[PDB]
Structure formats: structure tokens, C-alpha cells
Amino acid sequence: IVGGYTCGANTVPYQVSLNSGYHFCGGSLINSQWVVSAAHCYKSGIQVRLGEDNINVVEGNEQFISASKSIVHPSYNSNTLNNDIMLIKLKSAASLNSRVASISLPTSCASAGTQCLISGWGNTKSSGTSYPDVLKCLKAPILSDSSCKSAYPGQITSNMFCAGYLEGGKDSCQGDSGGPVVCSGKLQGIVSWGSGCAQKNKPGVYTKVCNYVSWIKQTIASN
Ligand SMILES: [NH3+]CCc1ccccc1
Ligand SMILES: [Ca+2]
Numbered sequence: 001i002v003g004g005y006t007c008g009a010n011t012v013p014y015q016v017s018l019n020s021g022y023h024f025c026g027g028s029l030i031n032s033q034w035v036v037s038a039a040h041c042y043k044s045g046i047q048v049r050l051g052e053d054n055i056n057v058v059e060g061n062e063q064f065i066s067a068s069k070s071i072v073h074p075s076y077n078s079n080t081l082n083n084d085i086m087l088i089k090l091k092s093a094a095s096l097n098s099r100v101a102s103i104s105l106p107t108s109c110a111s112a113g114t115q116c117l118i119s120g121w122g123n124t125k126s127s128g129t130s131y132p133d134v135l136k137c138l139k140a141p142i143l144s145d146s147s148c149k150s151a152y153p154g155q156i157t158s159n160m161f162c163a164g165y166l167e168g169g170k171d172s173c174q175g176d177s178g179g180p181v182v183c184s185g186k187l188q189g190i191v192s193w194g195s196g197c198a199q200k201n202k203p204g205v206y207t208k209v210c211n212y213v214s215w216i217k218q219t220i221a222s223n
Contacts, residue, residue: 001118002126002198003170004138009053010061012119012135014103014187015180017049018088019064026120026179028187029102032093034220035067037178038190038207039076039086046070048090051100055121056133061099065090071219073212082157084192084207087219105217106186109210112144116163116183118204120191122175126168126198131175138172140164142183143203151201159211161189164203172204173197181206 016027016035025041027048035048051061068091073083094100110116118138124130140163148162156162163181164171172179172191181189189206196202 001120001122001136001138001176002124002173004124004136007119007135007137009059010051010099012117012137013099013101015052015119015135017052017055017121018178019047019049020045023055023121023175025177026191027088028180029094029100030105030187030216031102031220032096033090035088035090036187036190036216037086037088038084038192039072040078040081040084040192041178042070042072042086046088048088050094053135054133063094063100065092065094067091069223071223073215080155080157081193083159085190085209085212087216089223103180103182103187104185105213106188106210109208110142110183110188112142114142114183116140116142116181116188118163118172118176118179118181118191120172120176120179122177123173123197126171126196138170140170148203148205151203152195152205156205159208160192161206161208162203163189163206166201166203168198168200168202171198
């Protein structure tokens with residue numbers, strides 16, 4: 001996250017870190033046994049780390065549960081990043097409390113103008129690199145579909161939205177991938193892609209979760 005603030009320990013209780021010996025992607029807990037992330041975060045041998053604030057320090061609220069199955073969206077295209085969403089099932093169910101909690105799926109798509117919370121452990125510089133160890137938070141509005149398509153001519157599908165600031169300085173960034181965009185207490189987006197980070201007229205692009213709600217529900221009902 002570039003241009004954000006420190007969230008505070010366990011103030012984003014649905015936030016997960018996907019670990020393969022190191023943090024590589026964020027994710028969101030949608031119930032005690034299922035995590036949703038970006039399909040471009042797919043990897044074998046994922047351990048899901050819940051209850052994290054400092055990802056380099058065991059602070060006491062963590063639950064490290066290995067993944068038993070990962071399901072990438074059947075129409076994920078890695079060249080266009082259309083349908084950049086995947087589900088991860090935990091080997092055992094997470095123990096849910098004030099600090100580890102699932103986030104609700106949407107019943108409505110969020111509109112342009114809606115303010116949202118984006119969070120992650122990704123890079124905090126738009127030029128060069130500095131990775132935080134504690135979770136960073138950013139409040140950003142969903143942008144109109146027409147300013148999104150004007151920023152990324154020919155690349156925005158109906159399964160994407162833009163969120164952020166057209167004049168840059170504030171954005172999600174590398175390592176924030178797969179993480180949550182929560183608007184009014186519902187998961188509306190997944191950190192998916194963009195052109196660099198926090199650049200003028202290059203806002204973050206996010207997977208539009210409301211389009212995927214019945215694939216998610218069907219898939220967890222059957223796996
Ligand atoms: N400018 C969009 C933000 C972004 C950039 C790279 C990876 C994930 C998110
Ligand atoms: Ca920790």
C-alpha cells in the first residue's frame with residue numbers, strides 16, 4: 001500500500017497472508033474454512049496465516065493453517081487478468097473470534113463514489129521498495145466505469161473496477177495482490193492489477209467480487 005496508514009493490530013480481522021516460506025499475496029477469510037484471493041496468486045504448498053499484524057513476529061493471535069485445495073476460476077485468463085479470483089480451502093477450520101473473523105460476501109455490486117478499505121503488506125513506495133512488516137490500510141473510492149476505461153483503454157472488462165485516485169500518490173502495490181477491498185462491511189473487490197503503483201491516471205484495478213457470488217457459493221457447497 002502506497003500513501004496509506006498503519007491499520008493497527010487485528011483491526012482488519014478477515015485479512016489473511018498467503019505464505020510459501022515468505023508472504024507473497026493477501027487474501028480474505030469468507031468463512032472458517034475458505035479464503036478468497038487472486039487467481040494470479042496461485043501456487044502449490046500454500047500456508048494460510050490468519051490473525052497477523054507483524055508478519056515477521058509471532059505476536060500471539062496467529063493461526064497458521066495449510067491449504068488442502070485451491071480452485072482457480074474456470075475462466076481465468078492470465079494475459080488479460082479477466083476473472084482473477086480463486087478460492088482456497090483450509091485443511092481444518094479456523095477458530096473464529098474478535099481478531100479472526102470472516103467477511104461477508106456482497107448481495108449488491110458497489111457503485112462508483114462508494115468509499116472502501118484496501119489493506120495489505122505490499123510495497124509502500126511508488127518508486128523503489130520498502131516492504132512493511134505490519135498491515136497497511138488505505139481508504140479509497142470506487143471510480144466510475146468511464147474514468148476506469150479512460151485510464152486503461154481496451155483493458156477493463158465487466159469483471160473489473162477501478163478504485164483509488166486519478167492523481168496518484170495513494171494506491172495498492174506489489175505484495176497487496178489477492179487482498180481485500182471492503183465497502184460497507186462487504187467484500188467488493190480483490191487487489192488484482194494496475195500500471196505500476198500510485199501513478200497519475202493509473203489507479204488500482206480490482207476483481208469485481210459481486211459478479212462471482214454464486215460461483216463462490218456453489219463451489220464451497222460442493223468441496
Ligand atoms: N496501480 C495499481 C495497483 C497495483 C499495482 C501492481 C500490483 C497490484 C496493484
Ligand atoms: Ca505475526
